[PDB]
């Protein structure tokens, strides 16, 4: 399993953090997700199976402007 992190916006409750992380957690490659309400930042253990892209459009549909910051 690879990390990515990227920027989560509109989040402000953990119902939201909730939301983002078990969607995240049920795609398919995703094992981990540590989600942190200070910074505004989500971040996902995946493998190979997933995809960035899709975790942050998943978002985007969950209902938080995101951005991929980093895969690593």
Do not use: P, W
């Not at 909730?18 to 997700?33: H, M």
């Amino acid at each position: 399993a690879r990390e990515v992190i990227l920027a989560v916006h509109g989040m402000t409750c953990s119902a939201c953090t909730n939301t983002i992380n078990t969607q995240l957690r049920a795609l398919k490659g995703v094992t981990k997700c540590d989600i942190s309400l200070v910074t505004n930042e989500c971040q996902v253990t995946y493998d190979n199976e997933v995809t960035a892209d899709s975790i942050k459009e998943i978002i985007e549909d969950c209902g938080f402007d995101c951005e991929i910051l980093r895969d690593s």
